[PDB]
RNA sequence: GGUUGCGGCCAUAUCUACCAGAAAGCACCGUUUCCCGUCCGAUCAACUGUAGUUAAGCUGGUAAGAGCCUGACCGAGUAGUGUAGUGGGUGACCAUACGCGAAACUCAGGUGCUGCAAUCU
RNA sequence: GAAAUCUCCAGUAGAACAAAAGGGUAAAAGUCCCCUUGAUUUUGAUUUUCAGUGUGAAUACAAACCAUGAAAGUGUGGCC
RNA sequence: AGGUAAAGCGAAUGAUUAGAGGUACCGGGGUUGAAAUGACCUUGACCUAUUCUCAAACUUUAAAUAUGUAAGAAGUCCUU
């Protein structure tokens, strides 16, 4: 007795979920709407801006879909920000804004829209979309993608939205999921939005723990105190980092070290190998011959 | 060897059931507010029974969730009433335990003539680090058999702490 | 009274499948349709909008118009003693490409290669398709292949 | 319909058929109504 | 070759029980000023990558495993069936002639492939 | 208390979806929470019963004007 | 493209004959010291592997015969 549900009949009549769903990655109910193109356009690719947030890293991609598999136009990473003068705090709001502005300028250099559609080179924290220039080509339209991530008012996913918008791309959006948005009286507080761009929310928390609890101020901010970084220096880091991105955003790969075959030679030492069918039946001969007289 | 498998109290859930509606319930709500500090949550009926005497969607029972350091105090408060002596029931196959008391006059508190007298149902779930595996949205999965909690292992933990016994 | 509804006698036709319920794969939506392509029709039980009538299950026709989510397909049907033209408007989820015309385009390219190649060498092409001809004469070797003498078996009760 | 294609409209009628796989399937349909076999350079000479 | 991000076909990819995993990555993991959301910072949101760990997840191997997938002169030219006779038989139904032809069953072998971009003794 | 409420484990749907019956659906078309009036306007094309007449219902667009969502989109009443 | 003939029930849905085992946590009648929080009986309670027979309004599987499309100048490619 008890239950005994998992029988031969249950396994035979079980429809497996695709695989991406079985892992817990993709939502196909959302992806049907995002990927599917208007059929009067035939073969115009529908670009979508992927944004993901792993532990201590941010990922950003621009993706086109085909029958064989998805093709990447261009991609950027938060661990490349060390080149532009940012070491600590790679999973902040300011990193997501910096990564978004980096991604846009990579793609616009390939397509050829550097001078035309520059973006916003002043930044007061305003709600704006990139306007089309008269007697010329329209801006590069990219739709925003989320995945299985939650959407709330003031989340890092919508920081990358404005990064791509301020970079030059026409990413259409509303004002109501940026930080400093009054819920009752629907208006934008531009002062509170500008602070999150230049690492303001973190630099205020520097001032509080500096005077108050010194144990937390040594536990947190080890790298800031080790590399000699004061509270008011945070404005100069993210301001100068934005200018460096608008200069040479080309992507250059690493030195790598060792060839692909040397990695393959090292990796195959530890990972195990299968047996032949004769060696399987040799183990059966051992189990029979050992347990025939019993020991 | 055992570094990560610490075995700890994850949460404590107090529950006070009643059989009627209205004013007696609202008194029992303020007992758990003094007990815990948090505002409790009110359950309600699934279907009409009649023999006990409650309709469907009548609204009757109350409960509250307790986590962290505040849960460990209220557990020992309840065990002080039970003389640190639980039976060999009071323990699931998965290794979660609980016990019943009558009257909230014990474990601190007072009579307070206006509010009245009520019993409780204590219940504690036990787990290990890596319970986020099941509870998170992105990438859900089952837990391996070595990491799962059992009855015998939880009783061995319970004898070590608290100065307590199994009796049966 | 007699029953003559829209989805009458459609118990097994619009029944989904064995172990293929739920969502559809994305390749169905990605496929392109220009005005001219031949397409076979298959109804899908899950998708209820732009669904074909039972008669057009397994029929084939040419595309005449394209729009947002659908394609216009003209199908010729028999009625009385005279064929009539009919216009349908089905969504992309039901339609798939036909593989009948597929083999014809392979034959056009191969014949063009054989005519162009052989004229500057062979002076003899033979490009019309031959029906399956009868046998030619041959000899069978009996070395290590001697005939086994058979005989009809007697009757037994299993 | 097949007898109409092979020009056997009247009772007792000849033709000759070039033997293929396709033409063999026509003869399967009409086998109760016709008798047929392989001629030689002798019967063909007399008929013509 | 290992791993991450977005995928295609959607079990050769699932399910159950026991062992193994260098490097990097992924994860668990540590905190609650600020946006945010709960009965509960568990979930979601923000913050640090610092205090810790391969225990789980994830990846791979093992098992005369259940299941799923190919094939066979394995069962079987058997069941069924289009066409024909002034064929048989009281009928029920059967055999022959020219053609087309299964499914269970039994045996044998396998147990995820692959596209774009990034990275690593 | 066999049956109230509370917690964990197994759970391919064996539940539920205003009614007859069949089909369909699992990060939903089921259950709960937030905002609203695409049950709106102007007219034609088209499937089903069919004389390829009408009646009823249903499907796919054009020009408008709105709702909702960060968006892609979805919506011209009730999953069919 | 199809769900009829046949096939199938140690494969869902529903129908159905016969024992064997596990008994165990358990619903019960006894016989044994009124005894049994104990045995052995018919036992259910299901469960576990087997076994006999079925289906217009059940089905994994799946013929024959009928049935849709194609086998080119209104064609296939190159250019602008």
DSSP one-letter string for B58-101:
----EEEEE-THHHHHHHHHHHHHTTTB--SSSB-SSS-EEEEE
Question: Which spans in chain B are helix H?
Answer: 23-35, 69-81, 132-135, 151-160
Q: Are A142 and A171 in contact (CB under 8 A)?
A: yes
Chain B CB contacts of A25 under 8 Å are 138-139
Torsion of CA A19, A23, A24, A30, to 10 degrees: -20
Nearest to B95 by CA among B117, B60, B126, B69: B126
All residues at 6 or more sequence positions from B77 whose CB lies less than 8 Å from its CB, including other chains: B107, B108
Measured distance CA(A164)–CA(A96) in Å, rounded: 10
Place of tokens 């070491």: A87
C132 and D19 within 8 Å at the Cβ level: the answer is no
Instruction: Measure CA A124 to chain center.
Output: 25
Q: Are A50 and A60 in contact (CB under 8 A)?
A: yes
Q: Are A154 and A146 in contact (CB under 8 A)?
A: no
Q: Are A46 and A35 in contact (CB under 8 A)?
A: yes
All residues at 6 or more sequence positions from C150 whose CB lies less than 8 Å from its CB, including other chains: none
Other C-beta atoms within 10 Å of B105: how many?
13
To what resolution in angstroms was this structure determined?
A: 3.6
DSSP-derived 3-state class of residue C29: helix
- CA triple B161-B162-B167, angle to 5 deg: 95
**Tokens for C95?**
């339609």
CB burial readout C117-140, b (16+ within 10 A) else e: eeeeeeeeeeeeeeeeeeeeeeee
DSSP string, chain A: ------SHHHHHT-PPP-SHHHHT---HHHHHHHHPPPTTS-S----EEEEEEETTEEEEEEEE--SS--EEEEEEEGGGGGGGT--S-SSSHHHHHHHHHHHHHHHHHHHT-SSSS---SS--------PPPTTSPPP-B-EE--SS----SS-THHHHHHHHHHHT-B----STTSSSB-SSS--B-HHHHHHHHTTHHHHHHHHHHHHS-HHHHHHS-HHHHHTT--STHHHHHHHHHHHHHTT----------S-HHHHHHHHTTTS--PPPHHHHHHHHHHHHHHHSS--
The CA distances from residue C34 to A43, A80, C66, in Å, are 11, 44, 7
Measured distance CA(C112)–CA(C108) in Å, rounded: 6
Nearest to A198 by CA among A87, A95, A105: A95
Nearest to A160 by CA among A205, A95, A214, A204: A95
Nearest to A92 by CA among A238, A242, A211: A238
**Tokens for A62?**
């621009």
Strands across the sheet containing B8-16: B41-42, B62-66, B8-16, B120-127, B97-101
Torsion of CA C75, C80, C81, C82, to 10 degrees: -30
The CA distances from residue A34 to A23, A49, A70, B139, C92, in Å, are 21, 11, 13, 22, 16
- Pairing mode of beta strands A143-144, A48-54: parallel
**Tokens for A267?**
């990796």
Strands across the sheet containing A143-144: A71-77, A57-64, A48-54, A143-144
**Experimental method used, please?**
cryo-EM
Measured distance CA(A220)–CA(A58) in Å, rounded: 21
Nearest to C66 among A31, A32, A39 (CB): A39
Chain A CB contacts of B141 under 8 Å are 24
Instruction: Measure CA A121 to chain center.
Output: 24
Other C-beta atoms within 10 Å of C90: how many?
20
Measured distance CA(A159)–CA(C60) in Å, rounded: 51
Helix H or strand E segment including C41: strand C38-41
- For chains A and C, having 3+ Cβ pairs within 8 Å is answered yes
Strands across the sheet containing C60-66: C82-91, C70-79, C60-66, C38-41, C95-97
DSSP-derived 3-state class of residue C84: strand
DSSP D42: T
Which residues 127-166 of chain B have a CB under 7 Å from nucleic chain F? 134, 137-138, 140, 142
Q: Are B29 and B15 in contact (CB under 8 A)?
A: no
Measured distance CA(C125)–CA(C134) in Å, rounded: 22
Q: At what angle do helices A200-211 and A190-197 cross, to 10 degrees?
A: 80
- Enumerate residues 75 to 134 of chain C having a beta carbon within 8 A of any beta carbon in chain D: 131-134
The torsion angles phi and psi of C45, rounded to 5 degrees, stand at -60, -35
Measured distance CA(A34)–CA(A45) in Å, rounded: 12
**Tokens for A286?**
């051992």
DSSP D19: -
Which residues 155-174 of chain A have a CB under 7 Å from nucleic chain F? 158, 161, 172-174
C134 and D22 within 8 Å at the Cβ level: the answer is no
Q: Are A135 and A108 in contact (CB under 8 A)?
A: no
CB burial readout A73-104, b (16+ within 10 A) else e: bbebbbeebeebebeebbebbbbbbbbbbbbb
Nearest to C71 by CA among B37, B126, A40: A40
**Tokens for A107?**
């793609």
- For chains D and B, having 3+ Cβ pairs within 8 Å is answered no
Instruction: Measure CA D34 to chain center.
Output: 8
């Amino acid at each position: 007795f008890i239950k005994d549900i998992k029988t031969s009949a249950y396994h035979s009549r079980y429809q497996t979920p695709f695989r991406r769903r079985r892992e817990g990655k993709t939502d196909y109910y959302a992806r049907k709407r995002l990927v599917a193109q208007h059929k009067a356009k035939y073969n115009t690719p529908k670009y979508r801006l992927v944004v993901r947030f792993t532990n201590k890293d941010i990922i950003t991609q621009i993706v086109s879909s085909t029958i064989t598999g998805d093709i990447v136009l261009a991609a950027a990473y938060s661990h490349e920000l060390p080149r532009y003068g940012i070491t600590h705090g790679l999973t902040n709001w300011s990193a997501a804004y910096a990564t978004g502005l980096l991604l846009a300028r990579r793609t616009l250099q390939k397509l050829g829209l550097d001078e035309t559609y520059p973006g916003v080179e002043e930044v007061e924290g305003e709600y704006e979309l990139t306007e089309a220039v008269e007697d010329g080509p329209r801006p590069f339209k990219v739709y925003l993608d989320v995945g299985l991530q939650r959407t709330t008012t003031g989340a890092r996913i919508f920081g990358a939205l404005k990064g791509a918008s301020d970079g030059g791309l026409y990413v259409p959006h509303s004002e109501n999921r940026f930080p400093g948005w009054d819920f009752e009286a629907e208006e934008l507080d531009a002062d509170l939005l500008r602070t999150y761009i230049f690492g303001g929310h973190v630099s205020q928390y520097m001032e509080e723990l500096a005077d108050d609890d010194e144990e937390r101020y040594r536990e947190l901010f080890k790298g800031y105190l080790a590399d000699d970084i004061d509270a008011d220096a945070v404005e100069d880091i993210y301001a100068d980092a934005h200018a460096a991105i608008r200069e040479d955003p080309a992507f250059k790969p690493t030195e790598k070290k060792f060839t692909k075959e040397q990695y393959a030679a090292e990796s195959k030492k530890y990972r195990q190998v299968k047996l032949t069918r004769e060696e399987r039946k040799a183990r059966v001969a051992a189990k029979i011959s050992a347990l025939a007289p019993q020991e | 060897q055992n570094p990560m498998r610490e075995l700890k109290i994850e949460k404590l859930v107090l529950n006070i059931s009643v059989g009627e509606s209205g004013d007696r319930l609202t008194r029992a709500s303020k007992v758990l507010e003094q007990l815990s500090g948090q505002t409790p949550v009110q359950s309600k009926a699934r279907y009409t029974v009649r023999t006990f005497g409650i309709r469907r969607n009548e609204k009757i029972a109350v409960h509250v969730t307790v986590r962290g350091p505040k849960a460990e105090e209220i557990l020992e408060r309840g065990l002080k009433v039970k003389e640190y002596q639980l039976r060999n029931r009071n323990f699931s196959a998965t290794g979660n335990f609980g016990f019943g008391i009558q009257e909230h006059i014990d474990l601190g508190i007072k009579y307070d003539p206006g509010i009245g007298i009520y019993g409780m149902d204590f219940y504690i779930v036990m787990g290990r680090p890596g319970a986020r595996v099941t509870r998170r949205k992105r990438c859900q999965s089952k837990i391996g058999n070595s990491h799962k909690t059992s009855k015998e292992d939880t009783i061995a933990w319970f004898k070590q702490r608290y100065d307590a016994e199994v009796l049966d | 009274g007699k029953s003559h509804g829209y989805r009458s006698r459609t118990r097994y036709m619009f029944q989904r499948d064995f172990r293929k319920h739920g969502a559809i794969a994305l390749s169905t939506y990605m496929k392109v349709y220009k005005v001219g392509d031949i397409v076979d029709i298959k109804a899908n039980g899950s998708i209820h909008k732009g669904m074909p009538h039972k008669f057009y299950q397994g029929k084939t026709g040419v595309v005449y118009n394209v729009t947002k989510s659908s394609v216009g397909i003209i199908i010729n049907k028999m009625v009385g003693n005279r064929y009539l033209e009919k216009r349908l408007n089905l969504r992309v989820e039901h339609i798939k490409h036909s593989k009948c015309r597929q083999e014809f385009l392979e034959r056009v390219k191969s014949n063009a290669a054989k005519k162009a190649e052989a004229k500057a060498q062979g002076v003899a092409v033979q490009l019309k398709r031959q029906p399956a001809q009868p046998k030619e004469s041959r000899v069978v070797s009996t070395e290590g292949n001697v005939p086994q003498t058979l005989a009809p078996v007697p009757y037994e009760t299993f | 319909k097949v007898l109409q294609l092979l020009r056997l409209n009247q009772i007792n009628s000849g033709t000759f058929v070039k033997v293929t796989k396709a033409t063999s399937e026509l003869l399967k349909l009409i086998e109760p109504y016709v008798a047929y076999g392989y001629p030689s350079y002798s019967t063909v000479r007399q008929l013509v």
